[PDB]
Amino acid sequence: ACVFFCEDAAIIGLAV
Amino acid sequence: ACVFFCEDAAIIGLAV
Amino acid sequence: ACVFFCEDAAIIGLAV
Ligand SMILES: [Cl-]
Numbered sequence A, B, C: 001a002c003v004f005f006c007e008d009a010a011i012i013g014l015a016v
């Protein structure tokens, strides 16, 4: 899989 | 939630 | 549509 990143600021990865 | 970003170029945020 | 990017490292685009 691979990691997408979002801005919460903190950077959060999300595995997909 | 948090904001993911895509390239349209313009940068577009998407709230999730 | 627009391209989101993930980290695999390689950078991978995903069209949405
Ligand atoms: Cl995750």
Ligand SMILES: [Cl-]
Binding pocket: B013, B014, B015, B016
């Ligand atoms: Cl949004």
Ligand SMILES: [Cl-]
Binding pocket: C013, C014, C015, C016
């Ligand atoms: Cl694609």
